[model samples]
Target chain A: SRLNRESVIDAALELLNETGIDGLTTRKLAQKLGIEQPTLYWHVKNKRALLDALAVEILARHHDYSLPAAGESWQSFLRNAAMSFRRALLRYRDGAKVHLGTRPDEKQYDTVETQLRFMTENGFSLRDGLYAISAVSHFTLGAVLEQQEHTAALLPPLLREALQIMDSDDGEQAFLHGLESLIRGFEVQLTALLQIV
Target chain B: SRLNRESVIDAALELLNETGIDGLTTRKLAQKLGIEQPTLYWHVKNKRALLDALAVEILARHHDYSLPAAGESWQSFLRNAAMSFRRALLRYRDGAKVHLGTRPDEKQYDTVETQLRFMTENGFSLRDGLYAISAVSHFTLGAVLEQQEHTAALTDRPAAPDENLPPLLREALQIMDSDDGEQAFLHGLESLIRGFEVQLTALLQIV
Candidate 1:
């Protein structure tokens, strides 16, 4: 009775920082919250529910660019949304993993629907727009997943050099370059379809 | 003594199909092979080591399109590699998750080095080539991760049309939640290649 959903999730996010996606548990979260497991269970029935809650909350906290500013081009919005997403996931340990298997929250339905409409108004079909959004989402998720993972290996000139650049600066340059490539690709797709239409 | 690295990994991959990633355990694996835990430990120090082996082997076994063919355009090669990758991952349960958080094998170095050189020869700098590769790798990994988890969403049927939502919103959810994730992956994969081509063509400034 003393705690609400927001505080419970808030503390859970803090716990996430301490013990990554793999290490998080009800017992730990309950301990962190100074509540019993059953109390925590009242808020989150299972680990899966907690993770689902965490995934949405993670975005709510750090993924502010899910929508566009007034007069933003779809291209710019896509980039911003993806960048925001990458930052959101990067904010926590194994943040990508937290999001990987979880479902989108009911809280996000309105925003996601609005974002999809933004694409249609910009001349994309629902199917194409959704594809574009999913592409960006998937690419960003994978990119951050790659970023969060630790790695190692040895001794080939070109391979070693490639690894260095990939490792450099949390994959910033390559990520930007790739994000642009996808945006440009969408532009090409949108333009070609319009010419025929 | 009877189990070698190859056979152990072979059994582990089969075990993955049965148990998925989370349920997979050292004890179960040892049990499957009819060996004691310590004997199995001789082959794999722990679950992490076993997973790393599974990740590489999953690719080595099914991800054959890692290399470009004789005269494949960079665009075509990228698409081919990505398609091959998605296909490979879809071959097993939790296949993409298996690949996640694992390092590439030494055996892969020669082929990967060749792939990088293939891009450089095709007018990409080493840095740009690796970027392209990483992009596709990231994208494919994301697609499969979504695919595996999408099944979870499928089972979670929201009762009758969520009446309160906007009609379009309802439609979007229906479309988003329904599929097996193949079409979206193919469409996104093509878009990525097209984007890379657009960049490459502009760099040349063709008349």
Candidate 2:
């Protein structure tokens, strides 16, 4: 029992990889933790609550580039942060689905505030900074919501090809291309605003 | 009671409003439409199917700006179409969530394909046009989903002061809470459209 009280989140994540979200059960999770069912409730109320914790935990555990390094441009930060988010979301089976249902927890507020400060220091007004940050976040959110679908038989030439492309590696290519475009789009706005002053 | 199949959707929609996404059950829906419970099954196989049908219908009934008008600029089309999509998504309880769970049915292919053609006529290749269209779509999806939750959060406690969650974060939350989300959405949408145009110019005219 010396190895006890390790990490419920730690074991839950490993168990998540095995059972997936749909199949994940608190009973099985308790077994894996070497504890009775009620002990798991010390940290989380139930399965639904556990998931919300995991949603925040997964990012905390994996999303490394949430804050930028010394003198990083906002564009690169946006690209890096977004890619990191997508990477985190794709780490588990149905990871994005897990994220889709939860909003940012209050614990992460300081990290987010730093992000806003980064924008302010670079050039963005608070409002526009929020817009730019949210746009990138939302776009990536939407991207992964589906990047993690069918019906191709009764299509015409172009539509059929489009579906195939969306389902392939090139589909991911389109997402990468669009992410670049979105970042560049912000760059264009920043330059225009800066040039004005 | 005399409503046609066309207006059965109206009945279901009203029932949905009276109830809500979770409260919406087949029994209540059947009660609303004055149909036998089993007869309701004829139209919708189950609650899941009913939701999928509702998701498609919500867009079909309200998503009027899916295609561009004749001689319209691509920018206007992008703006109008995205705005319309948002309008439709906000029209119901869990409207965007409904959309989130379902894919476009086969019935939507012709309409989507037509939208692709509009982009083609305007100079985008099929592939890039899709990226453009979907980028706009994905951004909207992200907006609506967040808006729903934000609205829920705001209503749940208009008094979060939300200490520690202030600073620039506080101002950011203030703007979102004050503006009803439209201004920021439009702002982001414009940024997104400009992004597409930048990509289009670089990829097309330069190539």
Candidate 3:
């Protein structure tokens, strides 16, 4: 029998991890799976469809609605959750970029629901809560994009080169400190906004 | 007799405005320019080089380094500079996406230098000033990306249509009364600078 659909998807994920989104193609996928390209199309309609499936697959696989047993506060829970999502995205190559335009809300609704519940229970107004989610999501996604653009080999050299051109160290520090500052900045702002609201 | 290189690039930009980065190719760019594909290549080496040149061209065209008369604060200068950069990116189709990974330091070193000089002259540490710039750049870039993506019909709609969903998002919705992308951006940006300055002042005062 030909490869199962789930098996084909799994192979795609593996290929994604190995080669990233740019390298992913029906022909390459079929070659990797040792199957005909048309046979692969039976499993996935096209490359775009395959990417959407991968997005859903990733959400289903890595996202855990089960929060820690008891103690964490809302902010902590959210911080942990955002970090978890980041970690999951970082697991695959160009995973964040892959999921950038895909709206897999059906598959990942529970994660969003859990977040919404946590925010409201902690006394966030709906708008504030959504804004918080949006901020964190945007920052995380942006960080991932930044990371992908500045892959291990390319980033440091670019950073060094950029630094030499700048008259001051501020520009250099800004690029280096990166998401850590954004995360901390988010935490601070979230606290104030929650207190005010 | 044939379309000039600048004309070809301009046509390619138009194609970008119509389609997006992924859809704009050499063949299509040639078609848009009413020339052969090889002719377009003569203007731009390849797709990657075209994107890089486009970004550089945008900055070069938009960046005006003439300073204000006297006592013009660094904050306003930097803010204006950033706004200019953001506006230029928004002018082109998928402009922000095209500018995403390209390095501006080489061709746009003067802009960075002006920012650094402004911040350093203002009583901020070198590191803190850089952090401010980073925060502003990230915030601006993030805002542009969101704007572009949202415009491209990618809003995150609920799949199952939860009418009475969770109460928390309602709380968030309360704060998010309208599209405050610019305000939200400024909030994060101001916080970074304020937080840095506060820390810097405290450290300076202690010493």
Candidate 4:
């Protein structure tokens, strides 16, 4: 049987969940897998390479590499893409922390090209396309980072206690209210900026 | 001799710039001051308390808590507050990181109260004020986190060398530009405030 890279990555993901970024050393990974550290290195070049591959794998799980169908507008396409990316980043423990250092790999080339082409087709100049993409990309990453850190660790305790002290029932209702607001804000800004042809 | 906490904090800030967060341990602080680590603890409760004090000191250095007389609109007030906070976070190394775990202390209380008062005085309900503060606070923190991390590490390496990175980012790289903490902060704050009003619709407009 062929030694599967996916299995190696899967094991790595498991270890990451068990520990964190600080604890995911190759020696520890090899110890967990009952193999020498060199074997893990043979599979992936180094710790950084392994992390990059894991990011690619994580993103691949969420994003479809296929081009958008005819008549699909950039707004909807881009919105869905952003949401997908967010969902993927939310998948693993500290997923955004992992993806932070890793950029889009060759496997996602089609997706990036499609996004660029779609922007150009939809009245965005090359520069405008770049700006629009950067704008959306930063917003999505910011949102995901907020979701991962703020929502989980900080918001619940502070919000619940604050609401309780005030004797209010606004916890669940206002949970993602800020995020919904951000999306609307992005739409307004993008509409004004992208139409500058 | 009278030992002032402010002078100790100032020295800590100087040491922080000289050596990063990890290097600002109690021993080093005491060593730098020619005092024992336990002696330093007399001034600060613990490592965590020292960090909290450091964060408060940083915020105090940049933010002026005095509100605009009595009639300034909440939107302008919030924007100014956000800008002040962003500038403070950007001033020190690992400032935001230091802030994350530090519980809000007495020093930051005035700014928080000012924010709350601005919201209520501007006709927002108390609940709305709290919500708005939360939104702005998270956005500010998020912006600062990006700024701090990029400055510390990401700026040195090229995000896109050839074509291996995302084509969108590659093409966008020109416009993407390097990290400008202030710019990222202002854009997000503008968008967020605009979004808050838009999302609230009649509720915010009626008042």
Query: What would the TM-scores of all predictions be?
Result: 0.93, 0.86, 0.77, 0.74
Give the DockQ-based CAPRI class for model 3.
acceptable
lDDT of 2 by residue, B1-207 (tens): 644656667787787777666578889988888889888877777877777778889998899998889889998999999999999999987678777766558768888888888888888989888888888888888788777755543433333346657578777877876865789889888777888787777764652
lDDT of 1 by residue, B1-207 (tens): 359888898889889899888889999999999999998888889888988888888888899999988889988898889989899888988888888856756788988889888998998878888888889999999988987866544444333337667656677667766776878888888888877776766775851
lDDT per residue for candidate 4 within B75-112, as digits (tens), equals 77778777777777767787776665556565456556
Candidate 3 segments exceeding 4 Å error: A1-5, A59-69, A152-197, B1-5, B62-83, B103-105, B150-187, B190-194, B202-207
Model 4 chain A TM-score equals 0.75
Ranking by TM-score: 1, 2, 3, 4
Q: What are the runs in model 2 whose C-alpha is more than 4 Å off?
A: A1-6, A11-42, A46-48, A101-103, A149-154, A194-197, B1-8, B34-36, B152-161, B204-207
Best by DockQ: 1
Clashes of each: 0, 0, 15, 0
Query: What TM-scores result for chain A when each predicted structure is judged separately against the true chain A?
Result: 0.92, 0.82, 0.75, 0.75
Off by over 4 Å in 1: A151-154, A194-197, B152-161, B204-207
Looking at the true structure's interface, with contacts defined as alpha carbon pairs within 8 Å between chains A and B, what fraction does model 2 recover? 0.49
lDDT of each: 0.83, 0.77, 0.63, 0.64
**Highest TM-score, which number?**
1
Total residue pair clashes for candidate 2? 0
Residues A10-118 of candidate 3 have per-residue lDDT tens digits of 8899899778787788898888889887877777677777877787788678856336437677656656666766666777888877776454255455556676676
Compared with the true structure, what per-residue lDDT tens digits does model 4 show for residues A112-178?
7777778888876666555445444555554565555544354333334445533343232343455
Candidate 1 has an interface RMSD (Å) of: 2.0
lDDT of 3 by residue, B119-194 (tens): 7778755666665666566656766676675555333332334465444443443444366366555555544444
Give the DockQ (2 decimals) of all models: 0.65, 0.49, 0.25, 0.27
